[PDB]
Symmetry: D2
Amino acid sequence: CPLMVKILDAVKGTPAGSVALKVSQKTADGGWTQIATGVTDATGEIHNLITEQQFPAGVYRVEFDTKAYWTNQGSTPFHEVAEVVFDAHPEGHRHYTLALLLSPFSYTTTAVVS
Amino acid sequence: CPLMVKILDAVKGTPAGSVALKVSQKTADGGWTQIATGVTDATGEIHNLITEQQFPAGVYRVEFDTKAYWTNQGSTPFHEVAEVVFDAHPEGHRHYTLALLLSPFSYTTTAVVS
Amino acid sequence: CPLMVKILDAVKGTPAGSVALKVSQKTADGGWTQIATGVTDATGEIHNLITEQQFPAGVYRVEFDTKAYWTNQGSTPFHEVAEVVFDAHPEGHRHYTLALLLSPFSYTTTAVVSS
Amino acid sequence: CPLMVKILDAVKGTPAGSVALKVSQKTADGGWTQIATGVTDATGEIHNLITEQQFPAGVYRVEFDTKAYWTNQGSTPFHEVAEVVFDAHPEGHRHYTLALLLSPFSYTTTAVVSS
Ligand SMILES: O=C(O)C(F)(F)C(F)(F)C(F)(F)C(F)(F)C(F)(F)C(F)(F)C(F)(F)F
Ligand SMILES: O=C(O)C(F)(F)C(F)(F)C(F)(F)C(F)(F)C(F)(F)C(F)(F)C(F)(F)F
């Protein structure tokens, strides 16, 4: 699996479970095609989110529904959504992990690329 | 000024100068329309980005062109853009500061709401 | 002032008010001497934390009492304290802003250094 | 394995390998006893840093040598060290992961605590 996520909750010190997300692929005319959806497990991960065949070189957008997460936690969040947008070059079996650390009024995101 | 930004560079320990951004407003039909552009000064700020009259209650998107910033620093960035999306004045009019801390493969966003 | 702090609360989206801190200087023998204490105002800052006379080149430690901040906010925090340790004026005199973004189980710190 | 670390490099998008760190345990007299030292592997982790037997309830300090990490990357860093200080098993045994995201002038640190 070439695309992994890891979401953490900075208030509770746990992974962020049951966060919905959407993966979209940029098209030649600059629009977006949705190619996958998923919900994190209790470890803040989505196993087998997409296949290598579904992940050619191109720009991708991962939309995390953080507002619903915080609302369900009982906190009022600032952000309507958290989007991560990046150009992927998966040649050579290159894999991407998107890490996201959530607080109600902040988030940190980073990427680990191997 | 009801909407302020503050962008810092975590590689250099300075504000991030000359970062381009675009402000869009969510439309009634669920789309977006661009209402302002700007470029940070050497303190990482944009004075008079929009007026209070341009900033009524509703959802806004600020698109920060972090890829161009890092390219112009001679670094290779991960993200195509950094987007911050939020509902403004949902319980009354306030002032918003969007803070953004940039590294080539990571960013931290937070908001200070008056 | 040559050493400024800015503390923000990532749960509430406000500055972190009434955070206590201590500034110390590393001694020739490897110990620490306290040179200042302070408590942030409602903007998350401490005006006139130290003077230039108190800030010769060397290693300094700023200890932020984040555990008491969260305990008073009514949250249960992870860290006992948050410490920022840096060599000041290594290549000549500079001014320093230490920014700190607090959550109960996380913090981010960065520095803005200018000539 | 009750204490794990995970260090990432925010400039390169890789784990931070070969980071030296020290683990100290606070003593009743308010001092610190060093109980372990380690170096991260190429995944930014240290396997078998300490045993459950070495990790009773109490306050611990993990000192990460971030300055040497950046100095060897050829970068110029701000912080002299990054220290993480926390009270362990305050309400019963848990497992602790200390995560650290490094940039030359910033770091973010969070904890994941199991049950
Ligand atoms: O331990 C792991 O392997 C992990 F879960 F991926 C993680 F590194 F801890 C992480 F959560 F991704 C993370 F890096 F810590 C982070 F994403 F939370 C971060 F990098 F943003 C922060 F800054 F918090 F460390
Ligand atoms: O108040 C300011 O003008 C400021 F100093 F620029 C700042 F907003 F505090 C900041 F340092 F930029 C910041 F917000 F703290 C940040 F962006 F750096 C951050 F939020 F990312 C971090 F977490 F580092 F504090």
